[PDB]
C-alpha cells in the first residue's frame, strides 16, 4: 500500500513433530502444535503478535479420518538469566483432533469378535467325532493369519500398548487356553479303566452334584 503497509501470504507444507499418544487407539484424541518464531532476531529487534486468538479454518477441506474439535494460538515471552531484559517470542498454534474409528472397527475388531465367538463354540462339539483339535487349531491358524493384517494396519510404535493390541492379545490367550483345555478333555475321555480308576471326589462332584445343579439341560 502507499502507506508502506505490506501483506504477504505465501503457501507452505508444514511437517511438524508431535507427541502421539496411542493408549486409546483407534478412539484416540491428539493435540498437535506448530511452533513459529523469528530465527536470528530477538524480541527487541523484531516483535511478532498473533492476528487472532484462533487459527483460520474458513476454507478447511474436511478430512475423512479426523475431526477438528478445538484450535487456539498463544504468544509466549521467554527470558534467560544471562540477559535480563531480552525477550524471545514465539506463537504456538494447537489443534485438537479426534479420530473417526470406522476403518479400524471394520478391518481389525469385527474379525477378532468373530474369532472369540468361534473359540467358545468348540466346547459343544462331542469328542466322539474326531474334529475338536481340527476346529480349535484352525481357529488359531485363522487368528495367526489375521495377525498379518494387524501388523500391516496398526502402528508399530513402542510408546505404549494400544487398546486394539490389548484386545488382539486377549483373543490370542483366549484361543490358546481353549486349546489346552480341549486337550485335557480329550485325554479325560479316552481314559482306559485298565490303568486309571476313577477317584471318589471326581465321581462325587461330576456325577452326583453338577448334573443335578445343571438346569438348562436335557
Amino acid at each position: 500500500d502507499y502507506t508502506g503497509k505490506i501483506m504477504w501470504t505465501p503457501p507452505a507444507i508444514f511437517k511438524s513433530y508431535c507427541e502421539i499418544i496411542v493408549t486409546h487407539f483407534p478412539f484416540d484424541q491428539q493435540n498437535c502444535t506448530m511452533k513459529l518464531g523469528i530465527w536470528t532476531y530477538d524480541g527487541t529487534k523484531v516483535s511478532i503478535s498473533p492476528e487472532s486468538d484462533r487459527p483460520d479454518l474458513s476454507t478447511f477441506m474436511e478430512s475423512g479420518e479426523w475431526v477438528m474439535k478445538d484450535y487456539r494460538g498463544w504468544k509466549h515471552w521467554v527470558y534467560y538469566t544471562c540477559c535480563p531484559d531480552t525477550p524471545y517470542l514465539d506463537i504456538t498454534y494447537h489443534f485438537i483432533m479426534q479420530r473417526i474409528p470406522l476403518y479400524f472397527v471394520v478391518n481389525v475388531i469385527i474379525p477378532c469378535l468373530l474369532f472369540s465367538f468361534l473359540t467358545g463354540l468348540v466346547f459343544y462339539l462331542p469328542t466322539d467325532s474326531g474334529e475338536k483339535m481340527t476346529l480349535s487349531i484352525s481357529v488359531l491358524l485363522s487368528l495367526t493369519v489375521f495377525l498379518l493384517v494387524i501388523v500391516e494396519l496398526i502402528p508399530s510404535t513402542s510408546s505404549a500398548v494400544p487398546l486394539i493390541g490389548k484386545y488382539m492379545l486377549f483373543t490370542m490367550i483366549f484361543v490358546i487356553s481353549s486349546i489346552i483345555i480341549t486337550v485335557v478333555v480329550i485325554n479325560t475321555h479316552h481314559r482306559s479303566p485298565s490303568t486309571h480308576t476313577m477317584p471318589q471326589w471326581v465321581r462325587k462332584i461330576f456325577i452326583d452334584t453338577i448334573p443335578n445343579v445343571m438346569f438348562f439341560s436335557t
Partner: protein, 50 residues
Amino acid sequence: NYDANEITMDLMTDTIDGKDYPIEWIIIDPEAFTENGEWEIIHKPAKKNI
C-alpha cells in the same frame, strides 16, 4: 575446503564460575524434547579426532 594448517576444528566451550570447559556432548533441551517412539538415548558424547 582447507587443510589442517589453514583451518582448525574444535569443540565449543562454556563458563560456570569464571572457568572454561569444553562441550563434550550433544546438547538436548530437557523441556522441548519429545522422545522417540522406539529409541531412547543413553549416551551422546562428542570428540575431536586427529
